[PDB]
Amino acid sequence: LNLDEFCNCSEHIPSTIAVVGATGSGVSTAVANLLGLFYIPQVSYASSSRLLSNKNQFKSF
């Protein structure tokens, strides 16, 4: 919605349904911002910071 104009992307670009990552908690937070912007689930394997338990910010983590 942020752009009034219309953007174009080639159909060859696929749609990611979920993401596996990442290792660092700061990296996971930065990724989680954009991913939860679009409600894309993200499942981490090494990030263990408690700050990523807050669901008022990280909707899909």
């Binding site: 919605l1 942020n2 009034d4 409600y39 909707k59």
Partner: protein
Amino acid sequence: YGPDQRAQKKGDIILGGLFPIHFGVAAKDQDLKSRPESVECI
């Protein structure tokens, strides 16, 4: 966004801006039964 929710002016060099016009966002919870929609700040 929308004409009522943005301040635009054309020029040679464009500067961005980010200001809080609302103190906080909606407290409505999400159950993901339907497609999530845009949230409205209150």
